[PDB]
Amino acid sequence: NPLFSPYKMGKFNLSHRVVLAPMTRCRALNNIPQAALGEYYEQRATAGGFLITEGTMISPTSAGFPHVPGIFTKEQVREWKKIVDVVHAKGAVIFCQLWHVGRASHEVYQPAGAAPISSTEKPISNRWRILMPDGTHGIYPKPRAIGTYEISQVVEDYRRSALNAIEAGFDGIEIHGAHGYLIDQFLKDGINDRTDEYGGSLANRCKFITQVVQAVVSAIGADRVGVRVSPAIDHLDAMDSNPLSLGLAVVERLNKIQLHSGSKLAYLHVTQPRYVAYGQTEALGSEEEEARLMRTLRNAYQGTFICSGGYTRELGIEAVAQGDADLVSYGRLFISNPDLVMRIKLNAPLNKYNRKTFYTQDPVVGYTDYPFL
Amino acid sequence: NPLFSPYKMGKFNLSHRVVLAPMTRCRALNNIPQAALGEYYEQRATAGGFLITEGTMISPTSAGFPHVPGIFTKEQVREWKKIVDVVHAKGAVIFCQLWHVGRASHEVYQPAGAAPISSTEKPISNRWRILMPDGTHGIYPKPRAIGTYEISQVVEDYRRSALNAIEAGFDGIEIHGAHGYLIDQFLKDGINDRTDEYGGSLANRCKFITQVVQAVVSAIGADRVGVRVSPAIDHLDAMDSNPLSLGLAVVERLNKIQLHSGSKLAYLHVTQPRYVAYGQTEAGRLGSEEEEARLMRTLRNAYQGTFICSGGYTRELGIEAVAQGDADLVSYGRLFISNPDLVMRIKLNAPLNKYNRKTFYTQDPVVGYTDYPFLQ
Numbered sequence A: 001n002p003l004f005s006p007y008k009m010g011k012f013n014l015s016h017r018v019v020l021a022p023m024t025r026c027r028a029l030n031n032i033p034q035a036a037l038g039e040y041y042e043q044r045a046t047a048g049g050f051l052i053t054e055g056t057m058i059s060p061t062s063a064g065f066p067h068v069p070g071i072f073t074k075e076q077v078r079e080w081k082k083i084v085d086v087v088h089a090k091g092a093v094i095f096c097q098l099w100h101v102g103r104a105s106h107e108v109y110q111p112a113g114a115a116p117i118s119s120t121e122k123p124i125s126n127r128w129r130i131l132m133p134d135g136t137h138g139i140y141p142k143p144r145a146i147g148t149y150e151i152s153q154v155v156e157d158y159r160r161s162a163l164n165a166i167e168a169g170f171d172g173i174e175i176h177g178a179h180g181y182l183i184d185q186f187l188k189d190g191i192n193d194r195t196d197e198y199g200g201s202l203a204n205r206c207k208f209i210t211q212v213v214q215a216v217v218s219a220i221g222a223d224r225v226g227v228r229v230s231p232a233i234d235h236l237d238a239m240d241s242n243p244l245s246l247g248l249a250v251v252e253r254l255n256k257i258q259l260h261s262g263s264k265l266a267y268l269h270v271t272q273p274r275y276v277a278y279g280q281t282e283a284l285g286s287e288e289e290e291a292r293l294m295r296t297l298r299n300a301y302q303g304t305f306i307c308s309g310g311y312t313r314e315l316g317i318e319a320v321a322q323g324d325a326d327l328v329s330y331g332r333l334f335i336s337n338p339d340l341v342m343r344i345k346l347n348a349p350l351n352k353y354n355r356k357t358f359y360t361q362d363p364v365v366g367y368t369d370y371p372f373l
Numbered sequence B: 001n002p003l004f005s006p007y008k009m010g011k012f013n014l015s016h017r018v019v020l021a022p023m024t025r026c027r028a029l030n031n032i033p034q035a036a037l038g039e040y041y042e043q044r045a046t047a048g049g050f051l052i053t054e055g056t057m058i059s060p061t062s063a064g065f066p067h068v069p070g071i072f073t074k075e076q077v078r079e080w081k082k083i084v085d086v087v088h089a090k091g092a093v094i095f096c097q098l099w100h101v102g103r104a105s106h107e108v109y110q111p112a113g114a115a116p117i118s119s120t121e122k123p124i125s126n127r128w129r130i131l132m133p134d135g136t137h138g139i140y141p142k143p144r145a146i147g148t149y150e151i152s153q154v155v156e157d158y159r160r161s162a163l164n165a166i167e168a169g170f171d172g173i174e175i176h177g178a179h180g181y182l183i184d185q186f187l188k189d190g191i192n193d194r195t196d197e198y199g200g201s202l203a204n205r206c207k208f209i210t211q212v213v214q215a216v217v218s219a220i221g222a223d224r225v226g227v228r229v230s231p232a233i234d235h236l237d238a239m240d241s242n243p244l245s246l247g248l249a250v251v252e253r254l255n256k257i258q259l260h261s262g263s264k265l266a267y268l269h270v271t272q273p274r275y276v277a278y279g280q281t282e283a284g285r286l287g288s289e290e291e292e293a294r295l296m297r298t299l300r301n302a303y304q305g306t307f308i309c310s311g312g313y314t315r316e317l318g319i320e321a322v323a324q325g326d327a328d329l330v331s332y333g334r335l336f337i338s339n340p341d342l343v344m345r346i347k348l349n350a351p352l353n354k355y356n357r358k359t360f361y362t363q364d365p366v367v368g369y370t371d372y373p374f375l376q
């Protein structure tokens, strides 16, 4: 079984290749990680396994979901340490994803009702709604375009959060630059319309993520830095006119950073869209084109590649066997299977997941109440 | 069970409110209605039930899917006749949906590889791909913007198709003005940008659908005409900056036509988006469940006549839609694909067979089309 072969991610000896994909679960009450998260990650922790935490706030103005954990305060560092130690007791490697939602925020999630920040003043259209603390869905407000100085401050927020993650005991961090969030709002030409060095061309649109990656590498080392992007996903009105060229531009920039710094990044993480036969009301793409895009980016990048999005046991085995990726991270499957690692090894049946309990703030039901084999 | 209380849709005494939603299935090989369609509809016809056929071509240009039936030729009329008689033999009411895809087509689907027609020259973006005859997915080409005289030609195609449907024995027709096709390409301000009397204001953007509905009303009577719209669905890059205003403006014209004609239309059919909790990678549209429900009732209250609701409805949702007064009839889609006796299953609260998306839009007359089992 290819998925259970030893792999060397730098200085880490992984026993298998299944990874817990970063998934927001909204269980960190008052933006503070709780004891529920520790048991949540321990259940999915295995000897030599690789885990990625949910999107974690880097600043008070980076939340777009209710009760998401932060790592930008001293108190949150202490709570994360008890979770990391619990995971490390199982002999697993865990990274913390740094997440800034950008314009995908709301007044209820911003301090003193401040306007969300983004690359431009264009908001998210009415096609998308934002989940509210009371369970309803609200309208995305108009963001405020940030200047050159404020951009350097957001990069500083990434640097400090990475330092806090290492202080919390994490083995590394993952930069969330996908799914139409703050970094992805600078990369996609459908959102980026600035007339300065951060927009107007393919090279300029990638300047924000380069400074984010360079600062965190300069703080904790490239070997403890991961990057996640998704040029083919138009979540929250983040379509690109040429996902192929945008992906290659990002991949080329990462290679330049590695050569300049003389070090290899931890990995590259890319999610892909997956399409099925939809009706007219449901509302979509070419699967072969998406598969080719993943192969092209993997070939261009120099280092470990991680694929995600719609992958299963059979799909993951083929990806590793054909060399399309080094690691596979699973999402919704890990929600319903705390022991998904051993279930894949034994080809055991997989428990179904409940979408109504992906979010919400119950420590037990839909979060850790699912049973093992 | 309010879904099984009788409802009087004009002259038709329907024994229940479970409606077969229109669904393209790609079994009418070379646009000719096959005998498989008659088997497909016979399994699903019920005494006092209302059926709506798949989208049907009105001209050689209206094609955007493989092997979709036409009703623009007399040969297709006689093939359609055998299907209608079989459906009528089981005491069911059947309407034929007239469908023009507009810019949602390809050269392979057009005569002589001609460019598809639309309200604008803007194509559908790369976010969507069109199913190909060989099973792959291609790109949407650049459409051709039509003029005033060509708009009247398309209206004439709707009228001739409406006459042929009645000639085939259909109890009526439904105008497909939804899901980002030709009529929706005139309605949505995210697509329509014409400077003439067909673009700009709400009045101009509703002008095209008004002509189509009025022409078929003047041909076969308003009592045999239905209209389907989707103001709140962004299928194929068809979004409006104010879907609720657009739906009300459309309803306003329908009411005016009924007063002018002196008779009511068969019904108003509306499809709503449906939302669940998705992940970030799935990129599925996430809106407000309450907002869509309030839009549907607002269209229902504004319109004077029968209202048919569709999109993500179940047995419980369908029951509550009728009970609350939010709709008179409920049309079901994907569930009707895998459950030929869906009306019986809803009555008894029986288990529902799962549907195979792979056999959607395939060409086999039996596999995934008429081989779904009945209740034992």
Ligand SMILES: Cc1cc2nc3c(=O)[nH]c(=O)nc-3n(C[C@H](O)[C@H](O)[C@H](O)COP(=O)(O)O)c2cc1C
Pocket (backbone or CB within 6 Å): A021, A022, A023, A024, A025, A054, A055, A099, A176, A178, A179, A228, A271, A308, A309, A310, A311, A329, A330, A331, A332, A333, A358, A359, B278, B279, B280, B281, B282
């Ligand atoms: C509930 C949920 C929350 C998620 N949150 C994030 C997130 O915060 N950041 C991110 O990069 N991806 C997020 N994802 C996407 C996952 O990382 C992963 O790509 C996705 O689950 C698709 O993989 P799958 O086919 O196994 O479900 C989330 C997915 C789900 C289902």
Ligand SMILES: Cc1cc2nc3c(=O)[nH]c(=O)nc-3n(C[C@H](O)[C@H](O)[C@H](O)COP(=O)(O)O)c2cc1C
Pocket (backbone or CB within 6 Å): A278, A279, A280, A281, A282, B021, B022, B023, B024, B025, B054, B055, B097, B176, B178, B179, B228, B271, B310, B311, B312, B313, B331, B332, B333, B334, B335, B336, B360, B361
């Ligand atoms: C395979 C398939 C084909 C469809 N074809 C059409 C069509 O040709 N015209 C139309 O107006 N709606 C079409 N629809 C939409 C349905 O009529 C209906 O509005 C929608 O599927 C809601 O179905 P549900 O109640 O099962 O959720 C189609 C849906 C599916 C799944």
